[PDB]
Amino acid sequence: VNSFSGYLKLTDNVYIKNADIVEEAKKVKPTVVVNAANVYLKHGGGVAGALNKATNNAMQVESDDYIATNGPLKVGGSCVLSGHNLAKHCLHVVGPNVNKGEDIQLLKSAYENFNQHEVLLAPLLSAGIFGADPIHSLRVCVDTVRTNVYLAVFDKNLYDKLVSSFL
Numbered sequence: 001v002n003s004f005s006g007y008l009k010l011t012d013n014v015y016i017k018n019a020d021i022v023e024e025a026k027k028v029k030p031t032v033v034v035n036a037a038n039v040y041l042k043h044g045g046g047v048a049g050a051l052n053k054a055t056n057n058a059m060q061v062e063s064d065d066y067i068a069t070n071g072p073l074k075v076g077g078s079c080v081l082s083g084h085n086l087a088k089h090c091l092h093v094v095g096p097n098v099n100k101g102e103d104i105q106l107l108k109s110a111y112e113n114f115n116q117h118e119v120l121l122a123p124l125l126s127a128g129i130f131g132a133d134p135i136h137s138l139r140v141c142v143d144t145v146r147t148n149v150y151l152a153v154f155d156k157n158l159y160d161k162l163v164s165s166f167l
Ligand SMILES: FC(F)c1cccc(CSc2ncnc3[nH]cnc23)c1
Pocket: 019, 020, 021, 022, 023, 046, 047, 050, 051, 053, 123, 128, 152, 153, 154, 155
């Protein structure tokens, strides 16, 4: 039993809700919140900009030190950093950005990072400003993630489409 509330169950391990991931994280304080990161951990917009704003820029300060030490992530890769006031940990995951021409096949590799964590609150990778089809992202999530994932979808119209079209 966990503290996630109001989710629709899609499969044995995947759950979905129309919610602002920032507000959901602040309420649940999950062990892991997933950020829709880029390789530079520059949290300017989309989910990343919102999560970072909610940390009063502490996420960005920590991320800049991470990059200065380690260099950029790989597309499809991840790193674990602090969750600040939102969660115990933040798993920064880089899905391919279609608006940069990145290989959509890397979306499966990106979701594989979730399997290193028993339970996660997450957005749909590569959706939103990353330019991929969210219906496809949900399919890859369900077919790749085996751990327990609670997906927050900000847009109510998109949420209803994802549910109604789910096979
Ligand atoms: F305007 C900003 F300052 C701000 C402040 C607080 C909350 C939010 C919404 S979070 C979000 N953004 C994008 N895609 C998503 N997919 C799931 N969640 C999200 C945005």
